[PDB]
Design a protein around this ligand. Structure first.
Ligand code: XRQ
Ligand code: NAG
Ligand code: NAG
Ligand code: QUS
Ligand code: QUS
Lengths: 762, 762
């Protein structure tokens, strides 16, 4: 059947080493595992077979007693290792104190499920899965290697450090790859990372299965250029084989895991397809004394290792004619000159196997010391070794590993460990070698980006969408994933509220530079320096000059008999009204203020009433005594009363009008009704003036001035009728107001004031 | 050691029935399972014993050979079942020829991983997970129940049938619940479903874990009203207990699975919490002969079943004083009047257990018939029973099961089956019972939508966001599952093109009522039917009538002595200028086209030159068949040359101008130059000719017309200076041009022709 190593002794420690390769996908039911392995097989077998002798020669460990082993073979298969463990326990149905757990995590789970039935403590050296840390189900399981939650954290840190966002994930079926990828998915998709799609594949699947997997991987080729591989060594070897077969020169950047580590048997003959890969390897410096013992081994003298002969044939293809394992398949015959020195690699996880066996030895030594402190041997109270006591002792056995540091088992039976971020690279032509470019110990990732990517043209950033943080362009995501977005800009009215939202601020406002925030529009008023305002104010100035000139001339010629027909105050109140009109034009052009707008309203109400009440008195009186001032002031006072009514109704306040979202101006609260009320008032005044104008328009005067009053009436009537479209049609509004009122003030002067003075001076 | 229920026979068939409960959390390491179970325990053990007795009593099935059994207790735990299986195969280290596998999928997997190493076919009556369908790892595993892929499909179909989207998910940790929820997640998020969060919990977890899980479930309570539970029975019982404790009486609609089924253990004493829950049960009719056998059992006689005394005491709390297993913990004593009839409920999976036993018996019978057809009974070639031959025989056996149908296994070792959609409801007063509301069969889901929710008010559909495609409101996804969209509308300018992008009508289009497709807003014309157009046309018509009357008067009085100072033609030329100006006014408002705006522009350009040139010529002459005609002609030639040069530089066409995106107007070709070149030319003319008219003032003429002319041309200059900013300021152009040109021509309709009509009239 399956041969087994032997080493008789007082206490027997079983072991489970993957001596042969996993059974091929066809021979699974026969459980006929395949070709031999050096590193995971013979090297570990000889490591145990020599560390037991190193312990035995040591009197400080297990004095006066002999430690023995029964090394079995697990073929990296749960089904095979279960049956080998059954062979372990058949004696309990020499007893076995414990085993050194199998390398595979799923195999370790399968073995533990049976070992805990017989209180047989199991120590593992590579079973890195998290699921084994649950002491409720796996009480008798311990390991000198940290869980792979730390490994998932390390990979998340790696992809963080390289801007990688849209990665792809492959993991082998089982419990190591499955739980590792679950943890990585958690701590990545939580923070910022994005897995394009998660894939699974058995290690021993056929070539076509890897072909299909690589087709699915190349489906996302342009963007997901990074593959996060929680994959055992053989899975990555299969992936490289598929990469070669279907013609890929290494478009991807494989991101390996503890399975890949820095093994040379996963990238032998397929180096060109793996250049640039980044792997994670547990730090374990090579054990010197094992190398010095192993390199001298020869197939003739080594007889306690039944798998050494077939391995020796397999390594140097040859035939051992003088030994029973002929294996005539190899044509040639090897001389007594082939040595293991040439192309010798000691695996990474050798310090772990040695440390695990040393942990078992120290647990047994502490048990012996505690149970029988006096007796320096096999005390009669410890001959039936109780499993539970040994496990309890093992849980707290701190010692010094062959590496040099101290080995402790925490509450979950793990042990602290660092990491060494390897990086496959092509140092020389036809020459590739794993190179160390980093570290990771308790959340810290030190990794120089110079040995890796000795340039700035690194791998294409595995990013779904390029950043678009340039002003208006935001990001939107339809239904695919939170990582791929189609950038779109929103209107200039709005600014980016967040990454995924841009909202416009209120009517009077504007987004800031680069749309970072929003700012109020700088409001502007009717500027003092501008062609139309300057023209208006100069017009007001010249009109004022003329008006006070007329008042002065009137005052100096106060009692001239020809003008002793109308009231002296009448052609003084008309001057006053024209003066308030000019003051209204002057005060219209200004920053709109409460007092200022009140001034505008009161002037617009009062000035037209003042001057034209004189006309009303004239046309009525020509048709008595001196009460014409009274009959004008009654109309003026009712005008003041109504204007106070609207003024109380519409108190003066300033609002920033919004003709458009771009522009804002500041005005006061004169509304359409509030401006049409005095406009209608003046229209009624003009209607009454016309209703009294006919006879005055026809009856001449001494200086035929009634005719000039008539044309002044017609001109002011037409300028008043045509005014409405200019003010309402145009958005300037204030300019129309000032120009119209100023012109209406001028026209009455130009027909009556000049002729009287002109004749008087002549 | 645990007790077993032996039975004589040359062929021995093992069994694993969960007689006792799962070991408690604090007692796992000691593997001491809890209380006894009736339905999943003693009922199944009695079923197996009686059915083996029936087979041994049947001569047509396995003649001349007696079937035995070695029933063992699995306590529903993986660890206990493993030591039971090791005890099964202890002889192989009378051999067992095949076990009737345990119920739980994880337990079945753990037992199978050990049994298949010894070629022992295992038939499971209730293992349902999809992992067991893989024949590369589970070669020696068959079942008489369909996998849970169909169950996940039925769950998804049920969820789809009630528009549940934002459902919550909980699954018992293990291999049944875990794989079930994996299938559900995959092939529900495939079609349309959503998952708020997926939780997991061991079925034996303490009250604290259940309390935390229920709090986490309430964390989505407002929207996640449906809980998808791929949960074992005890997990649902724990959830119901938690709901009872932390006051949740009817805030969830549990969607159970086969684990819940129609069990009364899960909802015993907790009916009020579980009302309305929907569970999926594997259809299996009751077996009446089993009921007849079982209801007659008494602890006095039943000595071949070691657990019957403990179960009898636990069912009717008592102590059997006449038996070794008194267990005086219970106070009272069992009188000889208690019978199993009262409250007896057969377990749902009773057809499947008997079917599994019959399947193993029929496989053994087929293998015996094939091995030794001549011999009727045991043969020498069969005495070392080979597991491979038995498995081959079982894989292709067909027989009539107790339900009356035919039992067969496919290439994966499963067996077809159909489900029933049970629903828990309050039948009456404090009387709760599992009711049947439909079945599922190979994608065919049938229900009774009136039996469950006998009203239009069903459960609040677990929807994260209400339908947001209302009118114009958009759909936007946030940083979570694309399931809870936020309702935002986009402006009336744009329309909802896609639920995640609503694009805008480009410049002159409008969205329809559905906001799916821009409507290309129709343009508006000059609005011939409107009061302002009516006034314009009436004014133009009256001016035309007056001009034609004046022309008729002139033609009749061709050479009257009064009109002799003025040139005969010259007055006719200004008449022509006026009537063509009125014609251009009348045509100014219509639908712009090459047949209209052509003559529009030529008329407006040419009118102000011909009339005004004739007028200035009249002034010059007063200042016969001479240079007057040629100077008017050359002035017209140069003005028309300017017009034609403009037309060459601005061909006639209509542009649909866009003052705002809201509205669109149409206007024929027009530029600033096209409206200022005639403006500038004519303005130079008015300046020069107004200087001329002021020079004329009052001079002897034909009845002193010079004063009339000077006054009218003063009005002409003032109106020309007046409304130019009106056109430059106001938005309206056509109507204002109409009115202005019409009344400005009216100004020159009087001065030339009021004296003529007055002279004729007088
Ligand atoms: O209505 C006349 N033509 C005209 C056109 C325009 C104009 C203004 C702004 C933009 C574009 C075009 N303005 N405008 C005008 C001319 C004079 C007075 C008022 C308006 C007119 C009236 C009388 C005589 N005539 O008596 O010779 C000549 C011409
Ligand atoms: C990308 O990562 C590198 C670190 O090597 C650094 O430039 C920075 O953290 C990231 N750059 C951007 C633009 O995110
Ligand atoms: C579920 O939605 C469909 C359409 O989505 C509708 O016809 C039906 O009335 C809704 N309700 C039920 C109970 O099916
Ligand atoms: N670390 C893996 C085992 N393993 O697989 C390999 O290919 N190398 C290796 O160490 C596990 O934890 O299961
Ligand atoms: N399909 C279930 C079967 N089952 O689970 C229970 O808890 N009861 C029961 O019948 C499983 O795989 O365990």
């Amino acid at each position: 059947r399956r041969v087994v190593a032997h080493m008789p002794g007082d206490i027997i420690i079983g072991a489970l080493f993957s001596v042969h390769h996993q059974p091929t996908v066809d021979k699974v039911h026969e459980r006929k595992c395949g070709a031999v392995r050096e590193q995971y097989g013979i090297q570990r077998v000889e490591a145990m077979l020599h560390t037991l002798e190193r312990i035995n020669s040591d009197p400080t460990l297990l004095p006066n007693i002999t430690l023995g082993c029964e090394i079995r073979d697990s073929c990296w298969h749960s089904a095979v290792a279960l049956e080998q463990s059954i062979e372990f326990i058949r004696d309990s149905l020499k007893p076995i104190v414990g085993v050194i757990g199998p390398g595979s995590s799923s195999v370790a789970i399968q073995v533990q499920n049976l070992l805990q039935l017989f209180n047989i403590p199991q120590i593992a050296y590579s079973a890195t899965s998290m699921d084994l840390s649950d002491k409720t189900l796996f009480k008798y399981f311990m390991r000198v290697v940290p869980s792979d939650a730390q490994q998932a954290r390390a990979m998340v840190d790696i992809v963080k450090r390289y801007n990688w966002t849209y990665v792809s994930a492959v993991h082998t079926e089982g419990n190591y790859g499955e739980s590792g990828m679950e943890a990585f998915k958690d701590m990545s998709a939580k923070e910022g990372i994005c897995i394009a799609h998660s894939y699974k594949i058995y290690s021993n699947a056929g070539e076509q299965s890897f072909d299909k997997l690589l087709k699915k991987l190349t489906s996302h080729l342009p963007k997901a250029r990074v593959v996060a591989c929680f994959c055992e060594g053989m899975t990555v070897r299969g992936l490289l084989m598929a990469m070669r077969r279907l013609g890929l020169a290494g478009e991807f950047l494989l991101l390996g895991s503890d399975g890949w580590a820095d093994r040379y048997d996963v990238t032998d003959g397929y180096q060109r397809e793996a250049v640039g890969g980044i792997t994670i390897k547990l730090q374990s410096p090579d054990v010197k004394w094992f190398d010095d013992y192993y390199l001298k081994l020869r197939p003739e003298t080594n007889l306690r290792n039944p798998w050494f002969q077939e391995f020796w044939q397999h390594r140097f293809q040859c035939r051992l004619e003088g030994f029973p394992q002929e294996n005539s398949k190899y044509n040639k015959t090897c001389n007594s000159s082939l040595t293991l020195k040439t192309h010798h690699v000691q695996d990474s996880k050798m310090g772990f196997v040695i440390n695990a066996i040393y942990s078992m030895a120290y647990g047994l030594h502490n048990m012996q010391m505690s149970l029988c402190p006096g007796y320096a041997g096999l005390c009669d109270a410890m001959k039936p070794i109780d499993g539970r006591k040994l496990l309890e002792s093992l849980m707290k056995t701190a010692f010094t590993g062959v590496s040099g540091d101290t080995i402790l088992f925490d509450e979950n039976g793990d042990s602290p460990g660092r990491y060494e971020i390897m990086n496959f690279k092509e140092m020389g032509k036809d020459y590739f070698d794993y190179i160390n470019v980093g570290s990771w110990d308790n959340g810290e990732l030190k990794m120089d980006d110079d040995e890796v990517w000795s340039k700035k043209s690194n791998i294409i950033r595995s990013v779904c969408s390029e950043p678009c943080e340039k002003g208006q362009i935001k990001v939107i995501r339809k239904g695919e994933v939170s990582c791929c977005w189609t950038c779109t800009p929103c209107k200039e009215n709005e600014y980016v509220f967040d990454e995924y939202t841009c909202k416009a601020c209120q009517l009077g406002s504007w987004p800031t530079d680069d749309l970072t925030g929003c700012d109020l529009i700088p409001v502007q008023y009717l500027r003092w320096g501008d062609p139309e305002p300057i023209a208006a104010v100069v017009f007001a100035c010249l009109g004022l000059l003329a008006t006070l000139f007329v008042t002065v001339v009137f005052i100096i010629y106060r009692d001239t008999p020809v003008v002793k027909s109308s009231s002296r105050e009448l052609c003084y109140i008309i001057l006053a009204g024209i003066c308030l009109g000019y003051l209204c034009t002057f005060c219209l052009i200004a920053k709109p203020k409460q007092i200022y707008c009140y001034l505008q309203r009161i002037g617009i109400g009062l000035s037209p009433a003042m001057s034209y009440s004189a006309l009303v008195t004239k046309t009525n009186r020509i048709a008595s005594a001196c009460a014409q001032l009274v009959i004008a002031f009654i109309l003026i006072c009712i005008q003041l009363g109504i204007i106070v009514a609207l003024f109380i109704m519409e108190p003066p306040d300033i609002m920033h009008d919004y003709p458009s979202i771009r522009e804002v101006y500041l005005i006061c609260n004169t509304t359409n009704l509030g401006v049409v009320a005095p406009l209608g008032y003046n229209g009624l005044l003009i209607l009454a003036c016309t209703f009294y104008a006919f006879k005055t328009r026809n009856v001449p005067a001494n200086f035929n001035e009634a005719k000039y009053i008539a044309f002044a009436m017609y001109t002011t009537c037409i300028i008043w009728l045509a005014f409405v479209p200019i003010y309402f049609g145009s958005n300037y509004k204030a300019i129309t107001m000032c120009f119209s009122v100023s012109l209406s003030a001028t026209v009455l002067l130009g027909c009556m004031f000049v002729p009287k003075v002109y004749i008087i001076l002549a």
